[PDB]
Amino acid sequence: NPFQFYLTRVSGVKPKYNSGALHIKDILSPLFGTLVSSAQFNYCFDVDWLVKQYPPEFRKKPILLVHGDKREAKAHLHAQAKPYENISLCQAKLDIAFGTHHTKMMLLLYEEGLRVVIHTSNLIHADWHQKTQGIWLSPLYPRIADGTHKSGESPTHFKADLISYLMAYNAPSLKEWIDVIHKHDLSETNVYLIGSTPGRFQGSQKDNWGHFRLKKLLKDHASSMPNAESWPVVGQFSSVGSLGADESKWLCSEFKESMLTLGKESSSVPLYLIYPSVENVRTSLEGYPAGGSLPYSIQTAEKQNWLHSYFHKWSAETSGRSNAMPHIKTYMRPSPDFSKIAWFLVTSANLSKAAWGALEKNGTQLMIRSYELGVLFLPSAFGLDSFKVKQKFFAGPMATFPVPYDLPPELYGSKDRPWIWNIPYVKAPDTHGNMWVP
Ligand SMILES: O=C(O)c1cccc(O)c1C(=O)O
């Protein structure tokens, strides 16, 4: 397969549903490369657990943790890391209020080359145990010979774009990794980088990040088709921000507008949002504790009941993962019969203005609060007009894209409710025999 898109291993499904899945121990294995140094970009870390996932022979190689923690949280993380003299830390600046460092990425420097891993899991045991999570694995990028002058750039501009993303941190530890990337040949990369960084972007910078970045890529590198207004948009996420008093405030005015872009020319496009119901969580492998990683608060939700008519259940029979709650985030553009897709994005970005950006100053400025990162699969980058949807995620021509959940998405039933993490559920017990009392 050309896509190199994987799910994490799920404990408790039959082996047929983990053949081709990856655990973090698989990613860090010597079989992937002889580790010299690594950077772990993430949100939450269990440092003791994390070091154990590296092969024993590699556990003293340098590790950089890139995080966004402040004040006591920052102290707690440093205290976690203090016992390991090989671990350095980089605090990503979050100069806009309510921002988060959500990006989940491994930079893996080997004897043999460099690998980039963009994924959706926190570096804690529970995020790799029984959740649905996504991974993109880059090729092994060879080093450019010293004295040789070549760009090492791909047709998707991934090398420059990754360096640009790292430069936004303004961090000395990441300038070191920028210099590493400069020295490697990333020309085989067939995905486009879509990042968010905190800031207020106007003019020549508005298209660099967030949903304007997606819009720019779709305008430049996808083609519109006849009956494009019939191709739905699907968004799939593990949390929702405050979107406004109605759909015209942000969801359907600028977010949907960016996602329905195709091609360079000048809406009733169906929008499907996939988000676990209470029943999805209750009957999940984890039970109600899965809802600790689906942090939709009642304060947010009661301000936007209009949103929930868009919500569809989590269902993933195709990957045996209907009971493995999603912490992956994905966005895609299926055909009206869901048999093809015009593009697929896997990312850290949830359904929120903080993650995707919101227009300010009379539409001239895109304001983003958070760090996010994902990769975009476009048919043109593979010599194709569209992707055929793989019918069974783990089944057997390799030019079909492995969508990890079921299509078409299934609307919430009248008795379903979106999972809301900070109210109690005491009506029916979960798969472990417990209720939810936050
Ligand atoms: O895991 C994360 O990066 C995260 C952190 C804080 C709130 C969240 O909603 C999420 C998420 O849903 O991914």
Side-chain angles (χ1 to χ4, degrees), residues 43 102 104 122 238-239 293 295 327 329 350:
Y43 167 74
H102 280 289
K104 297 166 179 80
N122 291 280
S238 57
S239 198
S293 293
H327 190 261
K329 297 87 173 147
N350 274 316

Side-chain angles (χ1 to χ4, degrees), residues 120-160:
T120 65
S121 306
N122 291 280
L123 298 174
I124 65 178
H125 164 91
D127 263 37
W128 301 74
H129 188 47
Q130 292 177 316
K131 300 192 185 300
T132 299
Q133 305 263 26
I135 302 157
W136 173 74
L137 282 195
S138 82
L140 181 64
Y141 300 128
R143 219 173 162 290
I144 294 161
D146 272 89
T148 292
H149 289 304
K150 58 171 69 170
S151 70
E153 185 56 278
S154 79
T156 70
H157 214 69
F158 187 86
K159 185 177 171 180

Side-chain angles (χ1 to χ4, degrees), residues 355-397 399-433:
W356 282 104
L359 283 172
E360 285 179 351
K361 294 204 183 312
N362 201 22
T364 72
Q365 183 168 277
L366 184 73
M367 189 274 293
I368 295 168
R369 301 184 187 266
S370 292
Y371 298 84
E372 311 281 352
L373 202 58
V375 295
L376 175 68
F377 298 86
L378 282 173
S380 64
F382 296 80
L384 299 169
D385 282 290
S386 58
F387 299 127
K388 183 167 141 188
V389 171
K390 195 168 177 195
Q391 282 319 103
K392 288 283 174 181
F393 183 88
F394 294 107
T400 76
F401 191 91
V403 177
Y405 44 82
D406 300 322
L407 300 174
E410 187 183 355
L411 191 73
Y412 278 16
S414 71
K415 294 181 293 187
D416 284 310
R417 302 292 184 266
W419 172 263
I420 291 165
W421 75 334
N422 65 343
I423 63 179
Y425 304 100
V426 297
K427 204 176 184 301
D430 70 6
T431 50
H432 296 276

Side-chain angles (χ1 to χ4, degrees), residues 211 233 235 237 240-260 271-273 304 306-311 331 350-353 356-358:
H211 72 83
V233 167
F237 43 81
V240 193
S242 185
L243 307 187
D246 56 76
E247 69 184 40
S248 80
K249 297 299 179 271
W250 181 87
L251 181 71
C252 289
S253 63
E254 66 184 81
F255 173 82
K256 193 180 155 189
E257 193 61 33
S258 287
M259 300 203 128
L260 61 82
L271 173 64
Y272 294 78
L273 304 179
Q304 54 193 28
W306 60 266
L307 180 62
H308 306 138
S309 67
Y310 285 93
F311 276 20
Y331 303 82
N350 274 316
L351 186 67
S352 85
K353 294 154 73 166
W356 282 104

